[PDB]
Design an enzyme around this catalytic site. Structure first.
Site, PDB file in Angstrom:
ATOM      1  N   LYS F  11       0.829  -1.124   0.000  1.00 46.24           N
ATOM      2  CA  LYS F  11       0.242   0.089   0.137  1.00 46.24           C
ATOM      3  C   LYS F  11       0.991   1.239  -0.082  1.00 46.24           C
ATOM      4  CE  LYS F  11      -3.658  -2.953   2.256  1.00 46.24           C
ATOM      5  NZ  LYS F  11      -4.675  -2.455   2.895  1.00 46.24           N
ATOM      6  N   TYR F  51     -12.324  -3.704  -3.624  1.00 44.89           N
ATOM      7  CA  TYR F  51     -12.949  -3.645  -2.333  1.00 44.89           C
ATOM      8  C   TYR F  51     -14.421  -4.081  -2.545  1.00 44.89           C
ATOM      9  CZ  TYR F  51      -8.507  -2.292  -0.359  1.00 44.89           C
ATOM     10  OH  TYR F  51      -6.846  -2.699  -0.267  1.00 44.89           O
ATOM     11  N   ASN F 114      -2.247  -0.117   7.118  1.00 44.84           N
ATOM     12  CA  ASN F 114      -1.604  -1.412   7.195  1.00 44.84           C
ATOM     13  C   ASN F 114      -0.500  -1.694   5.873  1.00 44.84           C
ATOM     14  OD1 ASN F 114      -2.891  -2.149   6.145  1.00 44.84           O
ATOM     15  ND2 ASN F 114      -4.381  -3.837   6.915  1.00 44.84           N
ATOM     16  N   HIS F 117      -1.080  -5.917   1.383  1.00 48.02           N
ATOM     17  CA  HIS F 117      -2.549  -6.794   1.109  1.00 48.02           C
ATOM     18  C   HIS F 117      -1.775  -7.806   0.233  1.00 48.02           C
ATOM     19  CE1 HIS F 117      -6.454  -7.954  -0.351  1.00 48.02           C
ATOM     20  NE2 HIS F 117      -5.535  -8.455  -1.370  1.00 48.02           N
ATOM     21  N   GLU F 128      -8.311 -11.209  -8.320  1.00 43.07           N
ATOM     22  CA  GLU F 128      -7.692 -10.031  -7.813  1.00 43.07           C
ATOM     23  C   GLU F 128      -6.627  -9.761  -8.710  1.00 43.07           C
ATOM     24  OE1 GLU F 128      -6.278 -10.097  -3.493  1.00 43.07           O
ATOM     25  OE2 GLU F 128      -8.313 -10.140  -2.574  1.00 43.07           O
TER      26      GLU F 128
HETATM   27  N1  LIG Z   1     -10.399   1.876   9.507  1.00 44.53           N
HETATM   28  C1  LIG Z   1     -10.562   0.644   9.318  1.00 44.53           C
HETATM   29  N2  LIG Z   1      -9.886  -0.070   8.192  1.00 44.53           N
HETATM   30  C2  LIG Z   1     -10.366  -1.468   8.375  1.00 44.53           C
HETATM   31  C3  LIG Z   1     -11.084  -2.055   9.315  1.00 44.53           C
HETATM   32  N3  LIG Z   1     -11.179  -3.540   8.972  1.00 44.53           N
HETATM   33  C4  LIG Z   1     -10.364  -3.498   7.844  1.00 44.53           C
HETATM   34  N4  LIG Z   1     -10.090  -2.382   7.381  1.00 44.53           N
HETATM   35  C5  LIG Z   1      -9.390  -2.033   6.180  1.00 44.53           C
HETATM   36  O1  LIG Z   1      -9.689  -2.807   4.880  1.00 44.53           O
HETATM   37  C6  LIG Z   1      -8.820  -3.746   4.469  1.00 44.53           C
HETATM   38  C7  LIG Z   1      -9.529  -5.098   3.905  1.00 44.53           C
HETATM   39  O2  LIG Z   1     -10.260  -5.448   5.245  1.00 44.53           O
HETATM   40  P1  LIG Z   1     -10.663  -7.238   4.958  1.00 44.53           P
HETATM   41  O3  LIG Z   1     -11.215  -7.473   3.801  1.00 44.53           O
HETATM   42  O4  LIG Z   1     -11.341  -7.609   6.270  1.00 44.53           O
HETATM   43  O5  LIG Z   1      -9.080  -7.719   5.137  1.00 44.53           O
HETATM   44  P2  LIG Z   1      -8.603  -8.902   4.362  1.00 44.53           P
HETATM   45  O6  LIG Z   1      -9.645  -9.293   3.411  1.00 44.53           O
HETATM   46  O7  LIG Z   1      -7.962 -10.104   5.153  1.00 44.53           O
HETATM   47  O8  LIG Z   1      -7.112  -8.799   4.206  1.00 44.53           O
HETATM   48  C8  LIG Z   1      -7.505  -3.567   5.564  1.00 44.53           C
HETATM   49  O9  LIG Z   1      -6.429  -3.958   4.986  1.00 44.53           O
HETATM   50  C9  LIG Z   1      -7.940  -2.708   6.359  1.00 44.53           C
HETATM   51  O10 LIG Z   1      -6.779  -1.499   6.274  1.00 44.53           O
HETATM   52  C10 LIG Z   1     -11.416  -1.341  10.296  1.00 44.53           C
HETATM   53  O11 LIG Z   1     -12.065  -1.851  11.195  1.00 44.53           O
HETATM   54  N5  LIG Z   1     -11.096   0.141  10.299  1.00 44.53           N
END
Ligand SMILES: Nc1nc2c(ncn2[C@@H]2O[C@H](COP(=O)(O)OP(=O)(O)O)[C@@H](O)[C@H]2O)c(=O)[nH]1
Ligand SMILES: Nc1nc2c(ncn2[C@@H]2O[C@H](COP(=O)(O)OP(=O)(O)O)[C@@H](O)[C@H]2O)c(=O)[nH]1
Ligand SMILES: Nc1nc2c(ncn2[C@@H]2O[C@H](COP(=O)(O)OP(=O)(O)O)[C@@H](O)[C@H]2O)c(=O)[nH]1
Ligand SMILES: Nc1nc2c(ncn2[C@@H]2O[C@H](COP(=O)(O)OP(=O)(O)O)[C@@H](O)[C@H]2O)c(=O)[nH]1
Ligand SMILES: Nc1nc2c(ncn2[C@@H]2O[C@H](COP(=O)(O)OP(=O)(O)O)[C@@H](O)[C@H]2O)c(=O)[nH]1
Ligand SMILES: Nc1nc2c(ncn2[C@@H]2O[C@H](COP(=O)(O)OP(=O)(O)O)[C@@H](O)[C@H]2O)c(=O)[nH]1
Lengths: 151, 151, 151, 151, 151, 151
Positions: F11, F51, F114, F117, F128
């Site tokens: 990122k 997303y 973070n 990804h 993806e």
């Molecule tokens: N601000 C915020 N960002 C979040 C949160 N949960 C997830 N994200 C962001 O959105 C991304 C994707 O979420 P998710 O789809 O669950 O994670 P992935 O699918 O495992 O890696 C992460 O890289 C986070 O930065 C949250 O509770 N708050």
């Protein structure tokens, strides 16, 4: 001057030997700005135009063969004197005169094998760039440390 | 000359200050070939056998003694020019004349405490080779990416 | 002279750009002993006092205002030649003239941001040293390896 | 107990892919002592012997052959709980399960090639040490830092 | 709770076997901010007044002793949850059950020589802070990367 | 299964904080294959589509914009189990739950920032990959070490 650019490509050996994360490393810590980069196979075409000025000198075709045999990382770095500085950062083209602390000094032993490439001039730099990359390719952003690196 | 070999041994002080992983890693990433290796303590007559040329010289026995105080890592490395390049890698026997980037340059202060040694000549190389090892401790094999280091 | 000391401060830029560990380490692994160390924002008066001989330069005011921009990390490092060896370690004042492997050489590019400061001279060492820290901030201890370092 | 030891061997694969220096430094910086170490082509009988608890395994014989494939690095390391701790060091047996931080975590992916072998019980430990090493091949010395490691 | 600061002290053993650099670096790279830092030999009372909560216990005065056998590096770090994470960063108190990748995991062996310490609570963390530094030693600045750290 | 692939993107926050060579480097020593990469800024609708799911979830909007605020490194990696092993190397989405030894663990602290990804399913992988890559952008070679990485 602080915007001067250069063209960095890690040759096929660099990629076979695991050096990319390393190589890159060195440029980003140096304080330089990754303007562009892409991983790919070079076409014979490309290479030759790349190396056009070399067209004659014996190694040539081998050279082209070799650049062609594998993928490479092509990138563009931006900064004060990146051109000359990165040159240095890399070592003498013949790894055997490259000192330690430098790309080639640390990583490799034979010229044919020198894992990386750098624009010897800002000209080479421009041509090179433009030859490798379409313009919209080349990103424009500001590093947070900008004003830490730059006076 | 791509088979070249030199005698590299880390001194008890390298040993003690915990510089073995670092050091072999140096050689590893530049692409030289570890032929042989054995951690040992050294005999005085062997040193002696070895430090042969400096036979008198005021430091001579002070040396020997020291070299005998601890175990060492004896090794054989191979590659196009390893002798000379190695040297380079190492630095200047006199860690103050050794530039950063090189082993000594990097990690040590005085010439008495010089962490390593390297064949300074081919003939030299072998003798120490022959001297420290039994011709059967030398593993003949090829690197997986040799074709990446060598054309 | 194995107890020559030297003063090294890690400018605001080396701070902001996370090289506090990278920098120290270099010291640590070479073979120096950290003697005193402190993290603060030097006052201007301090500043000027510091950079007195360049009282005249075009950049002076400049120097001082950035040096006071942020926190720095002052430190005393002792060792055999600390002074002069800490400078080769540092590289050229002008990060562009400064080889790889050195701190500047590897992590920075403009002299107006050249992240570390080193004493040039023993008396300056002396001077700075004193100008930066009260006498009893300078810890005295011996190194376990100290005699792996020094003969 | 802090004079417990374990038998460290680096798989031809660890040798192939240059992890010798790296794996070594792992131990070194953890605080363990290198009791002994040499580079060798293990033999098949040694091998079988060396891997008898496994005499009736699909893989076995493949396990042999492979390990017989290239040279390896045999090492004995001592320290308090080296055997066990050493094993968390390693990670699991199956690189898949190995956490990042570990040697298997960090550099490898498949079981049939997991660059390293750790003794899994002190008995096993000395058993193997026995098997590999000639008692005269075991180094008696003391780290200048032993004090600093041990209470 | 991003301005949550914790107290991290590297022990005589950290300081002794060169991990002050390495250590500060890990905190750097995770994006906590160094608020204060000072290389100081503690004082028996302070040691006392600190390790006051383990006034009796087996070790105690064993602890005090040691912790004064050399200097230490005093530090304050800031970051969301620095404490918990710092801890994590640190390892399980006991070198024994501390994973690789943690401070302790990677560089130490017994709970007796556990190279560093960090607050285990806030409440705690402050008390130590108050206790080891005067207020004015507490450096407030803004990191460049900060919004790259924090949304 | 040795040909499985994953989408890894670093990122803007990881790019702003020079963690690219490191991030790659993690992939490269483990010994997974670099299949495609390119540096670039993501298009709103590239992002919304990527997303897509959490099209609803509060963060969505902020996510978008953020992701859009600067360039990324988009990649594809091949190896036996890359998708799963690749997450484990990344760590917990929440850096707070991320272990030391992992990319986030080591390198960042808040979810919102973070830095990177990794493909969470092999579908997602492939999906993806689509979104992001033109199939021809998938280079194909064979690492010289594959046979050492795999049996
Ligand atoms: N601000 C915020 N960002 C979040 C949160 N949960 C997830 N994200 C962001 O959105 C991304 C994707 O979420 P998710 O789809 O669950 O994670 P992935 O699918 O495992 O890696 C992460 O890289 C986070 O930065 C949250 O509770 N708050
Ligand atoms: N095999 C081989 N390749 C060579 C030789 N001299 C140069 N080359 C290759 O040609 C590249 C470009 O040549 P040159 O521009 O003169 O070096 P560059 O400016 O650093 O690109 C070098 O980096 C080498 O990889 C040689 O004698 N043998
Ligand atoms: N104490 C001491 N030892 C020295 C001195 N000069 C050389 N030596 C030691 O003797 C070794 C051999 O020196 P030299 O012949 O120059 O190097 P070699 O041929 O590479 O081993 C050095 O690497 C030092 O360990 C000196 O002035 N004093
Ligand atoms: N902006 C700017 N700063 C300079 C220049 N020359 C020196 N300085 C700065 O002031 C410090 C003192 O300069 P100098 O005495 O040359 O460097 P030294 O040998 O590293 O201490 C340097 O480390 C620089 O940060 C210059 O030409 N321009
Ligand atoms: N091909 C293959 N080798 C295996 C398998 N399980 C174990 N081994 C191999 O044989 C070695 C010894 O097995 P074992 O004693 O469980 O593991 P160790 O004592 O943990 O590392 C392992 O390091 C592997 O290289 C398996 O399912 N397949
Ligand atoms: N010698 C010794 N020291 C111990 C023992 N348990 C704890 N300590 C020491 O006392 C310190 C503080 O105690 P504790 O709060 O339990 O440590 P923490 O978890 O850093 O805060 C530890 O860092 C150890 O160095 C023990 O069994 N023996």
């Amino acid at each position: 001057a602080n915007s001067e650019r250069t063209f960095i490509a890690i040759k096929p050996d660099g990629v076979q030997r695991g050096l990319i994360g390393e190589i890159i490393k060195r440029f980003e810590q140096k304080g330089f700005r990754l303007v562009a980069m892409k991983f790919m196979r070079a076409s014979e075409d490309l290479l030759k135009e790349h190396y056009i000025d070399l067209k004659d000198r014996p190694f040539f075709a081998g050279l082209v063969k070799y650049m062609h045999s594998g993928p490479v990382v092509a990138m563009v770095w931006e900064g004060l004197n990146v051109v000359k500085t990165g040159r240095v950062m890399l070592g003498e083209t013949n790894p055997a005169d490259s000192k330690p602390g430098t790309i080639r000094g640390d990583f490799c032993i034979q010229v044919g094998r020198n894992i990386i490439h750098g624009s010897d001039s800002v000209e080479s730099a421009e041509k090179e760039i433009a030859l490798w990359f379409h313009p919209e390719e080349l990103v424009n952003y500001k590093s947070c440390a900008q004003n830490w690196i730059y006076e």
